[PDB]
Amino acid sequence: SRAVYAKLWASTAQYTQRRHYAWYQIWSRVIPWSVPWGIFAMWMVFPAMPVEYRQALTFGIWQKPNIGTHGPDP
């Protein structure tokens, strides 16, 4: 019947929308890889920043190294 043939033709009318739904599915699996790569980036540029900023991103945990040199002058 022509009615049946019409519904079969229309079954694939929303190709473009289904490709967009594919985009979402794949990008949701891939986007978490930004965290490992992000930690390493900050890890690399941390020593090139000022001392004042290095103590802020760590909540006062980080401090200058104490190796026993360059102490105050009497």
Binding site: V35, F40, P65, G68, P74
Partner: protein, 60 residues
């Protein structure tokens, strides 16, 4: 082995490779910092009295 398995570190941090790599980079960042700080303290204790900051210079 029973104690390790009861922390659920495998289920939450090592079963998924994306999270496994988060664990590697994060733990390595913190561990490397504690390792250096500890070795500096040992160095200062063994060498007490010989380093520059331990003997203030007196002017004539």
């Amino acid at each position: 082995f029973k104690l390790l398995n009861a922390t659920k570190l495998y289920e939450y941090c090592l079963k998924d490779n994306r999270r496994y790599c988060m664990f590697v980079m994060g733990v390595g960042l913190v561990s490397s910092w504690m390792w250096s700080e500890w070795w500096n303290s040992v160095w200062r204790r063994i060498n007490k009295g010989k380093l520059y900051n331990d003997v203030p210079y007196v002017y004539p």
